[PDB]
Amino acid sequence: LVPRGSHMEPLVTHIYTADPSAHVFDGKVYIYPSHDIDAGTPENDMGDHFDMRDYHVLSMNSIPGEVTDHGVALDIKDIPWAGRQLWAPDAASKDGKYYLYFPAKDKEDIFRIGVAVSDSPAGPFKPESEPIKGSYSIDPAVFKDDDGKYYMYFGGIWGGQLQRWTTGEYAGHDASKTDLEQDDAPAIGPRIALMSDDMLSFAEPVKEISIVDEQGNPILGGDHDRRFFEAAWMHKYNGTYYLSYSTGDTHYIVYATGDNPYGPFTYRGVILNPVIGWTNHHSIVEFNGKWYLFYHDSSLSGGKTHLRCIKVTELTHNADGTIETISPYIE
Ligand SMILES: [Ca+2]
Ligand code: NA
Numbered sequence: 001l002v003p004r005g006s007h008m009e010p011l012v013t014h015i016y017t018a019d020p021s022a023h024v025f026d027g028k029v030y031i032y033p034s035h036d037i038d039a040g041t042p043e044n045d046m047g048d049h050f051d052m053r054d055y056h057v058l059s060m061n062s063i064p065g066e067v068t069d070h071g072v073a074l075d076i077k078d079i080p081w082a083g084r085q086l087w088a089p090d091a092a093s094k095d096g097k098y099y100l101y102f103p104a105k106d107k108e109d110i111f112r113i114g115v116a117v118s119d120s121p122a123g124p125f126k127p128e129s130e131p132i133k134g135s136y137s138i139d140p141a142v143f144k145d146d147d148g149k150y151y152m153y154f155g156g157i158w159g160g161q162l163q164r165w166t167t168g169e170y171a172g173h174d175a176s177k178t179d180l181e182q183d184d185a186p187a188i189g190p191r192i193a194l195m196s197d198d199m200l201s202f203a204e205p206v207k208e209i210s211i212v213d214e215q216g217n218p219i220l221g222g223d224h225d226r227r228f229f230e231a232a233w234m235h236k237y238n239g240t241y242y243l244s245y246s247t248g249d250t251h252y253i254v255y256a257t258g259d260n261p262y263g264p265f266t267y268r269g270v271i272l273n274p275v276i277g278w279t280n281h282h283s284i285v286e287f288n289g290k291w292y293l294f295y296h297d298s299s300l301s302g303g304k305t306h307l308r309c310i311k312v313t314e315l316t317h318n319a320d321g322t323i324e325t326i327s328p329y330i331e
Helices: none
Strands: 016-025 028-036 054-060 067-075 082-084 090-094 097-106 111-118 141-144 150-154 191-194 230-237 240-246 253-258 265-272 283-287 290-297 309-314
Touching: 016 090, 016 283, 016 290, 028 090, 067 097, 090 141, 141 230, 150 230, 230 283, 240 265, 265 290
Parallel strands: 016 309
Antiparallel strands: 016 028, 028 054, 054 067, 082 097, 090 097, 097 111, 141 150, 150 191, 230 240, 240 253, 253 265, 283 290, 290 309
16 A cells, blocks of 8 residues: 555556546545456457446545555446446536446447446446436546536547437447548537436436637637547636547647536647557546646556556646646656
8 A cells, every 4th residue: 555646657557547537525536437458359440449347446535645446336247238348437426425427338339328326436336227318429527517517528539439429319330430521610529418406317408519719710620639539528717617628549638718518618728748558538636726637548558558557647727727738758
């Protein structure tokens, strides 16, 4: 039991970890990451090489600090609706219950988002027997706004299948493997829905978020440096709403700002430059008055994209609301 997270070192090494969603529950940091395994499945752009099967919840009392692995919180074998692939999760707390939101493919090989419930932030969690009605695609972030309303941000293109949901019904397994394939049109936007009071469903039809440049024009499909790929995250600073996300094939975490949960959000700049390994996935959390960026890389595995490790670093906002770009391997 030794302290970790002082010089951007891996927070845990006994398992591979990715896609960290960090929260402060009960005055502690709780982290909800994917648990990477060396499944030896084929590698490709639809992500079959990411064949995760369970979640472990991690916690820290301080940063740096000892990282507690609380064991298996949820196993894919116990989720009745799920076929494969437990991808980037998140958690929320309401009225003394804890909710784990997770993307997984159903038995028709279509990504949906499910919820599982516990009395403890560390789990374990009991999955609902079906996924959230009207959910689709991947990478949920459930954000509690200051007014007590909770919103799920979600979506991912390419293997996350968001490009196959243009009409509210799945376009089929022969549909686009990437995006709309119209680079001069506006890019695909992430999704948002207000959550129900009981946290098991959406309280409205799912909305799509507009992301625009500094001149107010939509980010285009061809603009891979700035357009949404996956890993939506929401935080607030100065009353401004910050939508951050991964750009996928250009390997950035970027951010965009707006004045309400639904946007539009105006692209501002880069949160995190590219890491070791193809994927880049993060969260941003305030703990004891300091802001932290949780992220991952493939450093521990010697550069294997599907065997990752989570890390943390301090994140600096300026008073005008801009954020200083982090480069992962400099200081
Ligand atoms: Ca996430
Ligand atoms: Na910048």
